[PDB]
Design a binder for this molecule. Structure first.
Ligand SMILES: *O[C@H]1[C@@H](O)[C@H](n2cnc3c(N)ncnc32)O[C@@H]1COP(=O)(O)OP(=O)(O)OP(=O)(O)OC[C@H]1O[C@@H](n2c[n+](C)c3c(=O)[nH]c(N)nc32)[C@H](O)[C@@H]1O
Ligand SMILES: [Mg+2]
Ligand SMILES: [Mg+2]
Lengths: 737, 51, 102
RNA sequence: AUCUAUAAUAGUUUUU
RNA sequence: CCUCUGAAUAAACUAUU
RNA sequence: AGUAGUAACAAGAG
């Protein structure tokens, strides 16, 4: 009644009526920002200038009726002059501090509910636990982290729709909450907010603070969880790490992700050991995930992953030979495979590598609302049987099975602007990208998959690319049934035996898991992982492993140099090089070892040629069992975040670069320390640790004709000198021993 | 590297050409609404200032 | 409803979708049923030839108002045919609910 | 595993 | 004499809400 | 005078 009376009063007047009539709802936004101008260009200078004035603050006229014009000492608190462009009056900060000490008192009991997030931050800080401070060589990586966790299974638009529905039921326009999660959250919040007495706008802002997920790119080390990112300024530094555990409750999904990462790292580093089982056991016993010992989590956490299963088998716990893919729990009943990196061309003219699994295999897929049995071969779907609830579930299962089969028809069905790199040019998992692309719309995938007549056996219904129940022809290899569940047996943890080399076997004697079946991806953990040992970098990422390996070699250069000179056999067997050897490509390890070792032998046979940098660079590559060969290497590769980064035998490289002006070593941009000059260094410009059977004598010598490539050095004989194009655009005269 | 007087050497007509090449095989209305901007910018005037 | 209905009836307590068809009524009714994909929205279709259709053959209004609507449609059609404007107006129904940016 | 939602405010970068 | 007043470029990004 | 520097301030307006 007040609204309509006020509207009538405004419409009675002329200017107000003209504004209300000529202005549409769209132009209301334009006129709302209408102003004479906020002539402020230096807010700090303006504030300093204004605070010297008598009455810089603005207040509503009600203040004249609530606060005296003067305090006890007669100091004026406000004046009657209005603020230009409004009807508010001018007041002094003395008025604010007078109100804070003599104003009427209210009941501020619901503020913690309105601002629950900040008080939750306070509570998390209050109950947190502080550990020691460790000084190390931090390697922070720029990644996307979450600063506002929001709700687990919601996005920004979905959260906004839920907020509108809960707070503004009649203003939701045409939106309908179709997702199950959105409906459940809306019902729960309406139940919670039932009979609420807080203003709708503030309730909307509260729900925004509670539900909307916000993410940002930051240079992070440790855990990327929201609780660990709010105190990132406290826990990580340029040279130090503070051990700290938030005092709240920890989400289960974060624990699962951190456990998977830790298990993968531990298994990968254990494979390169001489006794993998004992190394794995000790590493598991020396690791904590978010302040909790890893063994407790392994006992009380039901995670289906290969590395976690290997750890459990090593600890004698029952495992499940299952993994996760596309939201379904796969379980290989029969068959075996070997991973192979294959290059493929995408439908939208993109070239990418994929980890193709060869061999014939049979799996059973279990989903929250679907189930299936799959039989496949190398990039070939032999057959699929799906028994989902409704059409949507069966379609989702079919899409997941098609992408899982690695069919060329699936790859060629990629359309649109699909990208396989991050917005920061970081590689993405091709399979996850394909799944996300085909889950939005699989019309082209189904159309290009193919059709085939069916035999009408057992009454199992068909399915067509249009997702309809046909009975004559159906999608190639796909059938729809109703009596296939076999879901109870999925959670049937079985007792297994683990071999010394981490080969899990069944009671019968068949191999279930092996280290080769663990993913090669190098991810990051949601919760901080703490390792307690002599080498706190033993299960770290690749960059940290590289920098710390070279820093360890530099720090112990005295005894390391003596040992290299005297008894090299024991030096190559140091436990410090094994994390580095894990990074070297497996098929190359032995080869590289051989190569490097030969160089060292020559470096000992020819006196006067002792370059510290060469030995330091090549030492980590001699830690694998050598394989003799005559191959010449100009660089040695290391797997860093899925890319093969090369280390050049001669000269500086992107990874390992040494600066003579400062005598400093930089590894991937991190300072590994300064080498200390030795009197035994050969100051004659002679290199004897570059080629397998050649000695570099000097710079280019035009006498011996034009230079030739490194691989064409096999034609020379004893005592023959030649010019070689060894190095980055450099030609040098060398001779063959 | 740096480019000397980048904005004083780039011409609106070349931007019109680039837009025309980018919007090939597109509806005519889209091409027109995109092409108006270089057209207006190649006939622009500059206010001198206070004096 | 998934789409904006034309009317709401409080007495029957239901949304009513109204359509005016220049072609045969049944094809238009099938098109509307396909588009909305609902059975809780009463559909009522008229035509300039006096034909009519509705859900479950249900006509909410009495026959007097229906006759008034029919005669209004017939009168407008006669007026348009007098000026010779009816041919295109009939031929332009198919390309009617489409946006051609200019 | 992915992750460019909007709008306000301030700060930074972009010379013959 | 007296009254009033002490001065807001474009794009992108960053932070907070 | 002084600040300052390719053009201004060293009060402006009513
Ligand atoms: O966050 C990452 C990972 O930690 C997380 N994850 C993994 N497992 C779980 C579980 N069980 N619960 C919760 N979260 C989990 O998901 C992310 C996976 O990241 P990424 O490392 O990139 O994926 P991965 O390298 O594991 O490869 P992916 O595509 O997901 O494959 C999963 C699994 O399936 C195997 N696999 C695929 N294909 C085509 C196979 C095949 O043809 N034959 C066989 N035998 N296995 C196949 C993958 O190799 C993995 O084993
Ligand atoms: Mg530059
Ligand atoms: Mg309508």
């Amino acid at each position: 009644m007040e609204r309509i009376k006020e509207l009538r009063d405004l419409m009675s007047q002329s200017r107000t009526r003209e504004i209300l009539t000529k202005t549409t709802v769209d132009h209301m936004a334009i006129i709302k920002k209408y102003t004479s101008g906020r002539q402020e260009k230096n807010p700090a200078l303006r504030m300093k200038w204004m605070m010297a004035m008598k009455y810089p603050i603005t207040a509503d006229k009600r203040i004249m009726e609530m606060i005296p014009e003067r305090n006890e000492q007669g100091q004026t608190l406000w004046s009657k002059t209005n603020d230009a462009g409004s009807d508010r009056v001018m007041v002094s900060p003395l008025a604010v501090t007078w109100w804070n000490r003599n104003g009427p008192t209210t009941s501020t009991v619901h503020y913690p509910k309105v601002y629950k997030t900040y008080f939750e931050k306070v509570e998390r800080l209050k109950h947190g636990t502080f550990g020691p401070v460790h000084f190390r060589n931090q390697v922070k990586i720029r990644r996307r982290v979450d600063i506002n966790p929001g709700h687990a299974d919601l996005s920004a638009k979905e959260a906004q729709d839920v907020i509108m529905e809960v707070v503004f039921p009649n203003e939701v326009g045409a939106r309908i909450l179709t997702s199950e999660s959105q409906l459940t959250i809306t019902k729960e919040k309406k139940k919670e907010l039932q009979d609420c007495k807080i203003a709708p706008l503030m309730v909307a802002y509260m729900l925004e603070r509670e539900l909307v997920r916000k993410t940002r790119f930051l240079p992070v080390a440790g855990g990327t969880s929201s609780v660990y990112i709010e105190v990132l300024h406290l826990t990580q530094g340029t040279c130090w790490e503070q051990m700290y555990t938030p005092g709240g409750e920890v989400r289960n999904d974060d624990v699962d992700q951190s456990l998977i990462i830790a298990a993968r790292n531990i298994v990968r580093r254990a494979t390169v050991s001489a006794d993998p089982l004992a190394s794995l056991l000790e590493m598991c016993h020396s690791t904590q995930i978010g302040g909790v010992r890893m063994v407790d989590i392994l006992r009380q956490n039901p995670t289906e992953e290969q590395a976690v299963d290997i750890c459990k088998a090593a600890m004698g716990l029952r495992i499940s030979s299952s993994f996760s893919f596309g939201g379904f729990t796969f379980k290989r009943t029969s068959g075996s495979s070997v991973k192979r990196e294959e290059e493929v061309l995408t439908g939208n003219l993109q070239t990418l590598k994929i980890r193709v699994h060869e061999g014939y295999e049979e799996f059973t897929m279990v989903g929250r609302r679907a189930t299936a049995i799959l039989r496949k071969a190398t990039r070939r779907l032999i057959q699929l049987i799906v028994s989902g609830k409704d059409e949507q579930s069966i379609a989702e299962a079919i899409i997941v099975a098609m992408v899982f089969s690695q069919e060329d028809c699936m790859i060629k069905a990629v359309r649109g602007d699909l990208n396989f790199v991050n917005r920061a040019n970081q590689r993405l998992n091709p399979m996850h990208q394909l799944l996300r692309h085909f889950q939005k719309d699989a019309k082209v995938l189904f159309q290009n998959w193919g059709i085939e007549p069916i035999d009408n056996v057992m009454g199992m219904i068909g399915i067509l690319p249009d997702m309809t129940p046909s009975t004559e022809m159906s999608l190639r290899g796909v059938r729809v049934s109703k009596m296939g569940v076999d879901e109870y047996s999925s959670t049937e943890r079985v007792v297994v035996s683990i071999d010394r080399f981490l080969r899990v076997r069944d009671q019968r004697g068949n191999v279930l898991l092996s280290p080769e079946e663990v993913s090669e991806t190098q991810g990051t953990e949601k919760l901080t992982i703490t390792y307690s040992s002599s080498m706190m970098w033993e299960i770290n990422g690749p960059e940290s492993v590289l920098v710390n390996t070279y820093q360890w070699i530099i720090r112990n250069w005295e005894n390391v140099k003596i040992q290299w000179s005297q008894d090299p056999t024991m030096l190559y067997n140091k436990m410090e090089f094994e994390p580095f050897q894990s990074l070297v490509p497996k098929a190359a390890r032995g080869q590289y070892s051989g190569f490097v070792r030969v160089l060292f032998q020559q470096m000992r046979d020819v006196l006067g040629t002792f370059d510290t940098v060469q030995i330091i660079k090549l030492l980590p590559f001699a830690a694998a069992p050598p394989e003799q060969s005559r191959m010449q290497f100009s660089s040695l590769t290391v797997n860093v975040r899925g890319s093969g980064m090369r280390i050049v035998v001669r000269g500086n490289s992107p990874v390992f670069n040494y600066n003579k002006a400062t005598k400093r070593l930089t590894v991937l941009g991190k300072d590994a320390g300064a080498l200390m000059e030795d009197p035994d260094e050969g100051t004659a410009g002679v290199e004897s640790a570059v080629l397998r059977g050649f000695l570099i004598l000097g710079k280019e010598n035009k006498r011996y004709g034009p230079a030739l490539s490194i691989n064409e050095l096999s034609n020379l004989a004893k005592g023959e000198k030649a010019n070689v194009l060894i190095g980055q655009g450099d030609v040098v005269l060398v001779m063959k021993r | 590297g740096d480019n000397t007087k980048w904005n004083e050497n780039q011409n609106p007509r070349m931007f019109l050409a680039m837009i025309t090449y980018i919007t090939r095989n597109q509806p005519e209305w889209f091409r027109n609404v995109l092409s108006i901007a270089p057209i207006m910018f190649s006939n622009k005037m500059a206010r001198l200032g206070k004096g | 409803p998934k789409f904006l209905p034309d009317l709401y009836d409080y007495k029957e307590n239901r949304f009513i979708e109204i359509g005016v068809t220049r072609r045969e009524v049944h094809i238009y009714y099938l098109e509307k049923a396909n588009k909305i994909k609902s059975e809780k929205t009463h559909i009522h279709i008229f035509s300039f030839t006096g034909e009519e259709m509705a859900t479950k053959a249900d006509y909410t209004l009495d026959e007097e108002s229906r006759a008034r609507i029919k005669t209004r449609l017939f009168t407008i059609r006669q007026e348009m045919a007098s000026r010779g404007l009816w041919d295109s107006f009939r031929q332009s129904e198919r390309g009617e609910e489409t946006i051609e940016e200019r």
